Structure 1
Amino acid sequence: QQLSARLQEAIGRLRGRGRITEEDLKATLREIRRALMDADVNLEVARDFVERVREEALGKQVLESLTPAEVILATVYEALKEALGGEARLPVLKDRNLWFLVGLQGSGKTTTAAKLALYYKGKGRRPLLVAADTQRPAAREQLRLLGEKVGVPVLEVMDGESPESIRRRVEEKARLEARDLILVDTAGRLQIDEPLMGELARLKEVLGPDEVLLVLDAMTGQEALSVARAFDEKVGVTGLVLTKLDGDARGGAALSARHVTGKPIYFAGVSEKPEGLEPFYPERLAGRILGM
């Protein structure tokens, strides 16, 4: 099994050498921490994780084992799979469903809203898209065009329209057209922009979404921890979508975000196309981060 270059060296140099010193163990764990950071795992999360691995390995008698390379690798892999969610898990839909797509500017929210519309349409739900971004130029048209492409109607929020007015128009369109999955696409915003984070929280209070999905770009670096924490503390996140996984970013931001929120990573974005949505597989990301 091929690992990243760094882990192949750290693990490989231990193989066939019988029992290893405490210094070789400490050397190995340091390299694991550095590999995780190379993969854009937040430095504090990385430190925390390797402490968890150290303790687990020591309970598996790693310093008495004649195959500590095997013990360490197995501990790391299984711990990473687990911390990422363990197994694939999708949202559980109700009779009526209203979800928000939230996150930083450019992360993939508008495209993800449309991907979800297609995915659930194909499963016999009846989605409605809501273009709630009134600040980005041509945001409303952008979602309208994507809705047309996937054959799902798009309600476009008006300049200045109050949350209560939005709620009334949305519930009425959903009534007139028997729409059971409402997908609200929100504008990108900084997690430290208190006015816009306040706006978002007030749209959530009025609309009462069942799910609030943080859309996180796979290439996101060290700030993923702070961003996830803030969207969770200020608004309330119920799950995550990891986008742009058709690139080669390792995706370590997913571990940062899941660590601080405890929320499921539901879906993986895997192309720029409406069909580019898959269930998220924690084992798959574990391997990607570790360079399988």
Structure 2
Amino acid sequence: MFQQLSARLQEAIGRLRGRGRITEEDLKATLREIRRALMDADVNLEVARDFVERVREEALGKQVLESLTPAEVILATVYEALKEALGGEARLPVLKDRNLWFLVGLQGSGKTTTAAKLALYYKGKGRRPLLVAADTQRPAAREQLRLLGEKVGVPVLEVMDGESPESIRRRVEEKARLEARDLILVDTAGRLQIDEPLMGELARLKEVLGPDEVLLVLDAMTGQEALSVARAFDEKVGVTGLVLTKLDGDARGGAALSARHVTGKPIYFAGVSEKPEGLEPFYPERLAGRILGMG
């Protein structure tokens, strides 16, 4: 991911090197190509437009038309714009003595696998997590998490078919108290598409369990479609943060570049592989540099 956009941006900027001062026409042409590169990377249209306008403002604010090294000013301005579009500053969920987080998303988003990856990540951080398979309709879905969780050395509590939210709360609360778990991760039911029934169940489970965080897992490869899912989930359930999976997937990187603008939700973690340790915090600044070939 980002490979296509990265090459287009690096080319647009590099082609200005060693040519002395550039004309306003050169700047406009450059800004247009950047906007086009973003658009072709499935970046939201409004975001792409706002992006080039910000770079334009900041570039002129640095007298790019006067600079003898315009390529450097453009790189510096695009870098800041990329960093901000990607989230600005790295963000992570606030940890308290006791925490209960919800993992929501569609089937195939990597939600379940991410739930297990998240448990391992915080386990290595000194936390004592407890995984909860909350799909009261799909036993096989619950078994998938138990296997994934126990494999990483994390306990997993499976809900029973048709079990009520109140019953789930009780059992989870007990197991957490007995095993002294400080981080409860609830893996909610995942379906191929958004269906009112499931959304209602999620909303209800949220009311009874009262999670302090609701992480929405999204397949970054779905591009802008992911932002549509985010809106639906936020409007019907209420999310606090996002997790973009398959960032290593061969696809455009428009989702990550539009998330902040479109959803207003921070991207906490990123999925970079299938392996259990294929999850790491999302670093806006670091990603911005990688896209511009800064290493």
TM-score by length of 1: 0.89
State how far apart, in whole Å, the 1-side matches of 2:85 and 2:198 are: 31
State how far apart, in whole Å, the 2-side matches of 1:12 and 1:153 are: 52
Q: CA deviation at 1:88?
A: 3.1
Q: CA deviation at 1:130?
A: 0.6
- In 2, are the aligned partners of 1:191 and 1:197 still within 8 Å (CA)? no
State how far apart, in whole Å, the 2-side matches of 1:58 and 1:227 are: 37
CA deviations on 1:21-80 (whole Å, 9 max, x unpaired) are: 333222111211122233332233222222222222222222333322221221111121
CA deviations on 1:230-266 (whole Å, 9 max, x unpaired) are: 3223322222212123334353311222222333322
Q: Please, which moves more after superposition, 246-255 or 273-282?
A: 246-255
Aligned-residue identity in percent: 100
- In 2, are the aligned partners of 1:105 and 1:190 still within 8 Å (CA)? yes
SS at match of 2:221: coil
CA deviations on 1:112-160 (whole Å, 9 max, x unpaired) are: 1111111222222211111112445611110011122112221112222
Other-structure match for 1:193 = 195
CA deviations on 1:62-113 (whole Å, 9 max, x unpaired) are: 2333322221221111121123233433222101100011122211110111
Q: CA deviation at 1:3?
A: 8.1
- Distance change (3 Å), C-alpha of 1:43 and 1:189: farther
Q: Please, which moves more after superposition, 176-185 or 19-28?
A: 19-28
- Distance change (3 Å), C-alpha of 1:248 and 1:290: farther
SS at match of 1:242: strand
- In 1, are the aligned partners of 2:132 and 2:156 still within 8 Å (CA)? yes
- Distance change (3 Å), C-alpha of 1:271 and 1:261: same
- Distance change (3 Å), C-alpha of 1:193 and 1:117: same
Unmatched segments (≥5 aa) in structure 1: none
Q: Please, which moves more after superposition, 133-142 or 150-159?
A: 133-142
- Distance change (3 Å), C-alpha of 1:186 and 1:289: farther
Q: CA deviation at 1:206?
A: 1.5
Other-structure match for 1:270 = 272
- Distance change (3 Å), C-alpha of 1:271 and 1:4: closer
State how far apart, in whole Å, the 1-side matches of 2:4 and 2:229 are: 32
- Distance change (3 Å), C-alpha of 1:130 and 1:287: same
State how far apart, in whole Å, the 2-side matches of 1:27 and 1:117 are: 48
Other-structure match for 2:281 = 279
Other-structure match for 1:160 = 162
CA deviations on 1:211-236 (whole Å, 9 max, x unpaired) are: 11111222121223322233223322
Q: Please, which moves more after superposition, 7-16 or 267-276?
A: 7-16
Q: CA deviation at 1:181?
A: 0.6
Q: How many residues align?
A: 292
- In 2, are the aligned partners of 1:218 and 1:253 still within 8 Å (CA)? yes
- In 1, are the aligned partners of 2:199 and 2:237 still within 8 Å (CA)? yes
Unmatched segments (≥5 aa) in structure 2: none
